[PDB]
Amino acid sequence: KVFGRCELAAAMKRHGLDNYRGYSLGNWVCAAKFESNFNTQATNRNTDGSTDYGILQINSRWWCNDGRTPGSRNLCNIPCSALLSSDITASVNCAKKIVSDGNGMNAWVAWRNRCKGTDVQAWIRGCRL
């Protein structure tokens, strides 16, 4: 599913991301924009043979199990396929674990480069929440 901007903003709010670990909703929408272009089916293969999955590009080494990645730990206790769903629950729940692991939203390279320190609330302005 390719979410619309406001569609995703509302969904992320319904799943408890607004101000989660101090990160306002626009941070999460901005992260999804620059990680996946709002596409729940997005994937990215890495040099180590791991893959990033879903709207928040969660990696198969530490976080989800894709059965094809060396050094797998599956800390989110989910198949990576669950991160490709139209329902964002699995991606949100795993993202909450990632962001809480000591590194905040710096875990998301796209967020660091295109969202951190900007007027991220622009990503939710104009939307029904």
Which DSSP string do the residues of the chain spell out, in sequence order? -B--HHHHHHHHHHTT-TTBTTB-HHHHHHHHHHHHTTBTT-EEE-TTS-EEETTTTEETTTT-B-SS-TT---TT-SBGGGGGSSS-HHHHHHHHHHHTTTTGGGG-HHHHHHTTTS-GGGGTTT---
Report whether 101 belongs to an annotated binding site: yes
Positions marked active-site: 35, 52
Question: What is the architecture of the domain spanning 1-129?
Answer: Orthogonal Bundle (1.10)
Domain boundaries, the chain: 1-129
Experimental method: X-ray
